[PDB]
Symmetry: C2
Subunit: 82 residues, 2 copies
Amino acid sequence: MDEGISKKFAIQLLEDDAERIKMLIRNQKNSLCISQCKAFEEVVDTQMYGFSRQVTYATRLGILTNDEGHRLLSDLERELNQ
Amino acid sequence: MDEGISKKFAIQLLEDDAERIKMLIRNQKNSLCISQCKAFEEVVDTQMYGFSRQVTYATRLGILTNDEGHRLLSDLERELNQ
């Protein structure tokens, strides 16, 4: 019985579905997703480091006292660990 | 001399800069960034598993021969390894 029609249909549907799943897999492996999260993390580290360098420099110069300098770094440190 | 003006300015700039750095840290510690990447990864796995379940079901029914069924799964497997 023509229902060879249904089998033929089911088979090409499955093949076309495979393509859709392969596209998903490609969009995954080609994602910049994690990489983008890590790049942002890197910006923050560098921003934090450059500012902290300045707190230290201000302390060397006597613009901050040692405790003042240490309190600022301690606040950054405290932020970092929640 | 004031210049005590400059020192006063430098100290408050350093404090305000500290707030900008803490804002960055908070904004990254509150990042749902990695989570969102992993969530999508999870959608893809589930999409692929559901389809794969159907390839298997079709093979059981005789709609695909065993080699056909195995080929499709083998193609998805290949994509997963690029």
